[PDB]
Structure formats: structure tokens, C-alpha cells
């Protein structure tokens, strides 16, 4: 046993994995075994979801998060997002589950049987954290891998059946993407959009042409960047800016994953394109707008003139103006006027919600959809009692959007903490004071008094 | 083909269980590593075969 | 009689598994019978 | 539901997703066995 107690390693059991920092073989095992765990869950969770799945209920009434991801890719679904074939879901689950055994095998082998360090075994697989060129090479390999991943999505969309398009003319459907957006003005334009209301940065992406085009760009950027990093070593200015150690690199990635976590939270909360409401349920903004739509329809059927109906405050009860004048739904949902959805858009004119369209053109499928979304708003208790906090037990419902937003906020937050923990530690360790202040060389004692 | 399928899958499950306990114990046991390494090789090839068998027979039972 | 015969790591693992089972039963009971809302 | 041929494995399938959690708990059993050294 090498380095497997506190005396020899300097790390207590509860920091046990830090004993692995300079043992590239065992650390490869840890990583491969862990990748096994992720793949295991993906596979097993899918099979669990499928076994529990009732095809004629909406997915979002069934506590499903993985089947919705598969369906968005265009597998197993048809018009309106109806399930036409569960077999693609079965395949995804089984293939992940089988693959996890392989990863688990390699992980266990490297972790307990294989060479503890890889450097003496191989110059290609061995590494020194402080070897800047080797670090950028491995980074380069992984960037190429990621670029290929992004192009796999492009391949599915363009050449292997397409993607589920909630926006498809005549109703949501799986659609092949033949004209992906290549224009860098549009693609990178998203990146420079404000993250505030009515803009929403990248979260605002609202059509599959832009999504696919983005991944073409990202795929090429990642492959080009990967080649770049294999062929180069870090420049002088980068050398002087960073800490070059295993723990430092971990900290950079923790920071990055934290950022991505918060982005994913906002993506699933607001976006209804890559998170189709057919599969994930209505967004918070969507369901609130759907309520206003529902009662506008109801009261207009009863004879209300919804354009001229003045609410208790003086603002229109059903319809009012946004701060820039667009006609929008009234009541509290005034905040949600940036919402856009396939069931609502046919009522939209140049100036916002069109009163003549509202009076004459609302179709029964719009009433149904608005009623459905209003009554599946993403509100519910921790024990999955659907609805407002004062609602009685009856409906077993928490929106997948809530499950996915909350989990990813928690994860992103703790990852920011991990970033700070490890970035601060990497700095201190590099400078040589992570274990405490040298009693005979206490820096503050050589500094002038503040006063 | 349902007789072939349903038992091939049971055999897949059973072997997986044996391997799940067996592989790490073998890897970390001091003696009998020679006998272990071949059994693990055998189990792995047989595990892979059974996956493919179940995979093929799936389409003659679904 | 002799202290050490049954390793402490086994006692902890079994006791811990016992706690998980009983708590698990209590959670099952939240969804069935009295207190289930049904 | 799973295809009918696999229905007998329903109870097994119900349990699988929780297995990753067992790996975390296993780390503690293992450490207890080596006295958290």
C-alpha cells in the first residue's frame, strides 16, 4: 500500500482522494470508474423511466427527465410530441447500462490492479501536472472529442431524422434541419445579447436552425482549439497569470462547471425550444400567460369586450401595454410579456397581441393548450403535491422544469464553493503556506504597523 | 426462441452478479491470481457474448 | 465475552443498514395507509 | 412499460437507479474496514 494512510500521505481519510494527486494510474481509475457511474445512472434511470412510463399521459405528469432529452432529439415521438415508439428509449437505456460495465471494468482495473503511476510505463499516458505542454496536449485531445460530440448533434439534426421542433409549421413535429444558421453575426450575436428581460443572452435561442448552426460552429471551434493546444505550449503571459498544478486545474474546471450549472438552470426555466413544453411542461412564464389567455377566452365567450375591459386598477383586466407599447396580457403576467410560444404566437401582430385575431381567430387547440399549461404550472411541494402552497392533496405533480432548475442551482452553487475552496488552496499550496504560518517567519511580523 | 432468450438474459444477470463481486476480490487478493486472471478473461468474453445473444434474440421475442 | 471478535466495521455497517431500513419503512408509510392523504 | 419479454425484470429495474448511491456508502464501509487510517 503506497500513500494509503495519513502519516505517509499527509492527508486524512476524509481528504483521501487528495492522496491521488500524483498517482496517475490510480487517478485514471478513479476517473474512469466515475465516468462509469455517470453512464450507469443514465442507462438505469432511463430504463426505470421507461418501465414507469404510460405513453398516453404527458411525460411531465410522470416525473421524467431523461425520456424528454431523448424525445427532443427526435427519437420515439411524432406530431405534437406524441409517443409513437418507445423502442429508441429502451435502446438508449440499455446501451448506456452495458457501456457502464465496460467503464466500471477499466476504472476498477486501473484503481486497484494496474500500475499506480503511468510515467515509468508510458511517456504518452504519463503526465506531470507542472508539464505545461503535456497539459495542453491532453486538453487538446478532449477538445477534439467534445467538438466531435457537438457534430454528432448536427449529424442527428441534418442526416439522421432531425430534431423535435415545437415551432414546426402546422404544429410541433420532428423535422430535418436542412438550412442551419452559419452567419457568425447571428450565432455570435446571441453571445453578446444582454441576459436581462426581453433579451436573455443565449437562453433566448428560439429556432433549431440557430441551435444546429451554433453546434457546427462550436464543433469546429473545439476541433481547431484542440489542434491548436496539441501544437502549442502556453505563452508567457498565460504562464505568469495562472497557477500550474493539479489542484489549480481542478479549480478552473469547478468554476467553469458552476457557470454552466447556472446557465442550464436558466435554460430549463425559460427556454421552450430545446426544452419543449410538450415534454418538460410549460415554463413559469408560459403557464401564467396561459392563465390570462384562458380567462380572456372564457369571458369573451360570455360577451366581454376584452380590449375595452378596465380592471380594478385602471389597467386593462385582460389586455394592456408593455412599457414600450406592445399589447400584452394584463394582471400579474404583465411581467411575462417576453414569453413566446407556438400556441400564443398566431395571435401576435406587429404591435403585439392583436385584438381582431383575439376576437375571431382563437382555435379550440389554443384553448386546450392554454388550459393544459395553466393547470400544469411549475409550482408544487417537495413531496410532489401539485399546485400552490395552500393547495390540498390530490394531484401528484412537480414539473420537470422545477426539478431540473432546482437541482442544477444547488449543484452550480456548491461547485462555486468548490472553485473558491480549491482555487484558494491551489494558490496557498503553490506559494507554500497551505499548512499554516511559519512561526519563525510570520510575514505580518516583518510588515510595518498600520498605525 | 423465448426459451433461449429468457435464460440467456437470466444467465447475463447471474454472471454480472458473479463478476461484480468476483473481479474486485480477485484484483485485490494476494494468492491465486493466475487462476483468477483467466477466469476474469473467460467471464468477460462470456459476458460480451451473452449481451450480443440477448441483443439479437430481442428482435425475435419483441 | 472477548472484545474484538466481531469487527467494529461490520457492527457499524449492519447497524447503519438497520437504520436505513427502518427510516425507509417510515417513508413508505408516508405514501400508504394513515397520513397518505388517500 | 418495458417490452413484454423483459417484464419479469421490472422489480430489478425499479432498484437499479439507486445503485450509484450505494458506491458512496461503500466507500464508508471500506474505510471502516481499514480503520479510517
Amino acid at each position: 500500500a503506497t500513500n494509503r494512510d495519513q502519516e505517509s500521505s499527509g492527508f486524512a481519510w476524509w481528504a483521501g482522494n487528495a492522496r491521488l494527486i500524483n498517482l496517475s494510474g490510480k487517478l485514471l481509475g478513479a476517473h474512469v470508474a466515475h465516468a462509469g457511474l455517470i453512464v450507469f445512472w443514465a442507462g438505469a434511470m432511463t430504463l426505470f423511466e421507461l418501465a414507469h412510463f404510460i405513453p398516453e399521459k404527458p411525460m411531465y405528469e410522470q416525473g421524467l427527465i431523461l425520456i424528454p432529452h431523448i424525445a427532443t432529439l427526435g427519437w420515439g415521438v411524432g406530431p405534437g410530441g406524441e409517443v409513437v415508439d418507445t423502442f429508441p428509449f429502451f435502446v438508449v437505456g440499455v446501451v448506456h447500462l452495458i457501456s457502464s460495465a465496460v467503464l466500471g471494468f477499466g476504472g476498477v482495473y486501473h484503481a486497484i490492479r494496474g500500475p499506480e503511476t503511468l510515467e515509468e510505463y508510458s511517456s504518452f499516458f504519463g503526465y506531470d501536472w507542472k508539464d505545461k505542454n503535456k497539459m495542453t496536449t491532453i486538453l487538446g485531445f478532449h477538445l477534439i472529442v467534445l467538438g466531435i460530440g457537438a457534430l454528432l448533434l448536427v449529424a442527428k439534426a441534418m442526416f439522421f431524422g432531425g430534431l423535435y421542433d415545437t415551432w414546426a409549421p402546422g404544429g410541433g413535429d420532428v423535422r430535418v434541419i436542412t438550412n442551419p444558421t452559419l452567419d457568425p453575426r447571428v450565432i455570435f450575436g446571441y453571445l453578446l445579447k444582454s441576459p436581462f428581460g426581453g433579451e436573455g443572452w443565449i437562453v433566448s435561442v428560439n429556432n433549431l436552425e440557430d441551435v444546429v448552426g451554433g453546434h457546427i460552429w462550436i464543433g469546429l471551434i473545439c476541433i481547431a482549439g484542440g489542434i491548436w493546444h496539441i501544437l502549442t505550449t502556453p505563452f508567457g503571459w498565460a504562464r505568469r497569470a495562472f497557477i500550474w498544478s493539479g489542484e489549480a486545474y481542478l479549480s478552473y474546471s469547478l468554476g467553469a462547471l458552476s457557470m454552466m450549472g447556472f446557465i442550464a438552470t436558466c435554460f430549463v426555466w425559460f427556454n421552450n425550444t430545446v426544452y419543449p413544453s410538450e415534454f418538460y411542461g410549460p415554463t413559469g412564464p408560459e403557464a401564467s400567460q396561459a392563465q390570462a389567455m384562458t380567462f380572456l377566452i372564457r369571458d369573451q365567450k360570455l360577451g366581454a369586450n376584452v380590449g375595452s375591459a378596465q380592471g380594478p386598477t385602471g389597467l386593462g383586466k385582460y389586455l394592456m401595454r408593455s412599457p414600450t407599447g406592445e399589447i400584452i396580457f394584463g394582471g400579474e403576467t404583465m411581467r411575462f410579456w417576453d414569453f413566446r410560444g407556438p400556441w400564443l404566437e398566431p395571435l401576435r401582430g406587429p404591435n403585439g397581441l392583436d385584438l381582431n385575431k383575439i376576437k375571431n381567430d382563437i382555435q379550440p387547440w389554443q384553448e386546450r393548450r392554454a388550459a393544459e399549461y395553466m393547470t400544469h404550472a411549475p409550482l408544487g411541494s417537495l413531496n410532489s403535491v401539485g399546485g400552490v402552497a395552500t393547495e390540498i392533496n390530490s394531484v401528484n405533480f412537480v414539473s420537470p422544469r422545477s426539478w431540473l432548475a432546482t437541482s442544477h442551482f444547488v449543484l452550480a452553487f456548491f461547485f462555486l464553493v468548490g472553485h473558491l475552496w480549491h482555487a484558494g488552496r491551489a494558490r496557498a499550496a503553490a506559494a507554500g503556506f497551505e499548512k499554516g504560518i511559519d512561526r519563525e517567519s510570520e510575514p505580518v511580523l516583518s510588515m510595518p504597523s498600520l498605525d | 426462441m423465448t426459451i433461449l432468450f429468457q435464460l440467456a438474459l437470466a444467465a447475463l444477470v447471474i454472471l454480472s452478479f458473479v463478476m461484480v463481486i468476483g473481479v474486485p476480490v480477485a484484483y485485490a487478493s494476494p494468492q491465486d491470481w493466475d487462476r483468477s486472471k483467466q477466469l476474469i478473461f473467460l467471464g468477460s468474453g462470456l459476458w460480451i457474448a451473452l449481451v450480443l445473444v440477448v441483443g439479437v434474440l430481442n428482435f425475435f421475442v419483441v | 465475552s472477548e472484545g474484538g471478535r466481531i469487527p467494529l466495521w461490520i457492527v457499524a455497517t449492519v447497524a447503519g443498514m438497520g437504520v436505513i431500513v427502518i427510516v425507509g419503512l417510515f417513508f413508505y408509510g408516508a405514501y400508504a395507509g394513515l397520513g397518505s392523504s388517500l | 412499460k418495458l417490452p413484454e419479454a423483459y417484464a419479469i425484470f421490472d422489480p430489478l429495474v425499479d432498484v437499479l437507479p439507486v445503485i450509484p448511491v450505494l458506491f458512496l456508502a461503500l466507500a464508508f464501509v471500506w474505510q471502516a474496514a481499514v480503520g479510517f487510517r
Binding site: - | I21, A28 | - | P11, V15, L22
Partner: peptide, 29 residues
Amino acid sequence: VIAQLTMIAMIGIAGPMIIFLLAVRRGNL
């Protein structure tokens, strides 16, 4: 219900069994 509790019993014991078998055999824990 009986089928589900039997599965998690075999699956549940697998981990602690690995450790136990290794501890008995003076394995590389």
C-alpha cells in the same frame, strides 16, 4: 413488493460482501 425487496437485498449486500471477502483473505484494502 417481495420481488423488489429481494433485489435490493442482493444488490445491497454486494458491496459489503466484497469488503468482507477481502478482509477475510487479507486482501489489498
